[PDB]
Amino acid sequence: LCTRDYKITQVLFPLLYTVLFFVGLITNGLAMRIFFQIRSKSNFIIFLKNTVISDLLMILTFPFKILSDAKLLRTFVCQVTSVIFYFTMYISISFLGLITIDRYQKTTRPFKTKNLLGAKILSVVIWAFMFLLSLPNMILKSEFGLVWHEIVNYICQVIFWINFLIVIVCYTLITKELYRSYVRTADLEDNWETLNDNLKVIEKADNAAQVKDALTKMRAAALDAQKATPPKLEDFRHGFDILVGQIDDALKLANEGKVKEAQAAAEQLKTTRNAYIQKYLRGVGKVRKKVNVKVFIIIAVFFICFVPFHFARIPYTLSQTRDVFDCTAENTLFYVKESTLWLTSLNACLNPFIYFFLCKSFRNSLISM
Numbered sequence: 001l002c003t004r005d006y007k008i009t010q011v012l013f014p015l016l017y018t019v020l021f022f023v024g025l026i027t028n029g030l031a032m033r034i035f036f037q038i039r040s041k042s043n044f045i046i047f048l049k050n051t052v053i054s055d056l057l058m059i060l061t062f063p064f065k066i067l068s069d070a071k072l073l074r075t076f077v078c079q080v081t082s083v084i085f086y087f088t089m090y091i092s093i094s095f096l097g098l099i100t101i102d103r104y105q106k107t108t109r110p111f112k113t114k115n116l117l118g119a120k121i122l123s124v125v126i127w128a129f130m131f132l133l134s135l136p137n138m139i140l141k142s143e144f145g146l147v148w149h150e151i152v153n154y155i156c157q158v159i160f161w162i163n164f165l166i167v168i169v170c171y172t173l174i175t176k177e178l179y180r181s182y183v184r185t186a187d188l189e190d191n192w193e194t195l196n197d198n199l200k201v202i203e204k205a206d207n208a209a210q211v212k213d214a215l216t217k218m219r220a221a222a223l224d225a226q227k228a229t230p231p232k233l234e235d236f237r238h239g240f241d242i243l244v245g246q247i248d249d250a251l252k253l254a255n256e257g258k259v260k261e262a263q264a265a266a267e268q269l270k271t272t273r274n275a276y277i278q279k280y281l282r283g284v285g286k287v288r289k290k291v292n293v294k295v296f297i298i299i300a301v302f303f304i305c306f307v308p309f310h311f312a313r314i315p316y317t318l319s320q321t322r323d324v325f326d327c328t329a330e331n332t333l334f335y336v337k338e339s340t341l342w343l344t345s346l347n348a349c350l351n352p353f354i355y356f357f358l359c360k361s362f363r364n365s366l367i368s369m
């Protein structure tokens with residue numbers, strides 16, 4: 001009844017899925033070849049191995065979509081394959097949530113460092129549960145089928161929204177740890193450059209007020225650096241007392257009056273011994289964190305692919321009284337659903353990027369080929 005442009009409906013979208021089909025088949029194709037050679041020594045490799053299977057199963061659905069949309073039983077095959085598609089996308093969402101938890105657990109653990117049987121069972125449970133809830137939607141004109149369809153769709157939304165929350169919480173806790181790590185390093189680097197910059201002010205100063213003020217900044221910066229530099233586990237305690245001592249010595253001289261003596265007492269921080277102490281103390285406090293541009297690839301893939309579809313569904317699932325009648329609203333619903341479903345399908349082409357940037361043995365094998 002409602003008509004749309006064939007150039008978008010039967011040309012653009014079948015070609016848009018054709019790109020994803022070949023791109024997905026070649027990236028996941030060589031991904032399976034790489035994973036078949038390397039052994040599962042962690043939960044991470046196991047969940048990534050399962051993702052390859054769900055991606056390959058996803059790609060195999062696209063020829064049925066491409067052919068149906070370009071207008072080329074025919075209705076039965078594009079009814080079974082659509083069930084296989086939604087089965088395969090809620091499996092990917094499920095494993096991506098597990099990959100997120102695993103990666104977060106490794107950021108909470110020390111840098112560069114029993115669940116292998118458990119991760120295998122958990123993976124079996126995901127696939128078996130999805131297959132079982134997909135099964136009646138496949139073969140099984142009954143009113144049971146209508147209510148079962150609403151049950152399955154409800155279960156699947158709860159799967160997305162639970163994994164969306166796991167992703168938001170894990171990346172909130174990661175950002176928080178990365179922020180506090182960056183702030184600690186920046187403040188400490190600021191402390192040592194404040195100490196060195198105010199030495200230059202003292203060297204070029206005239207009166208006592210200039211000398212007294214610069215030494216006050218220096219003393220506070222030295223004590224802040226000390227606060228941020230606790231004793232090492234193996235002279236870090238003594239070193240700061242020597243440097244703070246000299247600043248206090250130059251300060252008490254600047255308070256008594258003598259400016260040339262205070263400038264020279266401050267210049268003592270430039271002796272080979274006092275410079276070596278400063279260079280050592282800078283090193284002790286310079287102590288590894290998780291890579292920003294790398295870890296955040298999961299949240300980026302999750303948001304690009306699955307977030308638009310499930311967010312767009314909210315207004316269309318609690319507003320219109322049964323159905324809308326205006327053609328301009330029916331067509332905006334068609335393109336919103338079709339465009340977000342394509343973004344969802346792009347997960348099959350974007351997951352090989354997770355293997356590349358987060359698995360070292362995968363990256364080296366692909367580079368060697």
Ligand SMILES: CCOC(=O)c1cc(C#N)c(N2CCC(C(=O)NS(=O)(=O)Cc3ccccc3)CC2)nc1C
Binds near residue numbers: 083137309
């Ligand atoms: C485990 C596999 O389970 C399945 O086989 C399975 C699972 C789901 C699910 N979920 C599913 N639905 C079909 C109906 C669709 C929807 O609600 N369309 S809309 O009414 O037009 C609102 C709208 C608007 C914009 C964007 C998106 C949706 C949502 C996906 N179908 C199947 C077959």
Ligand SMILES: CC(C)CCC[C@@H](C)[C@H]1CC[C@H]2[C@@H]3CC=C4C[C@@H](O)CC[C@]4(C)[C@H]3CC[C@]12C
Binds near residue numbers: 105166169
């Ligand atoms: C849907 C309603 C009722 C809210 C329930 C939210 C549940 C399913 C989710 C959302 C965020 C989740 C948590 C996110 C963070 C972690 C840390 C990780 O080391 C283990 C899992 C754990 C502890 C998750 C378990 C389940 C959790 C609490």
Ligand SMILES: CC(C)CCC[C@@H](C)[C@H]1CC[C@H]2[C@@H]3CC=C4C[C@@H](O)CC[C@]4(C)[C@H]3CC[C@]12C
Binds near residue numbers: 336339
């Ligand atoms: C760069 C990556 C993330 C992929 C880009 C995907 C997005 C931004 C693009 C590519 C193809 C696009 C769609 C192509 C078809 C139409 C029909 C037109 O009448 C309105 C816009 C609409 C509905 C587009 C919206 C945005 C869209 C889904």
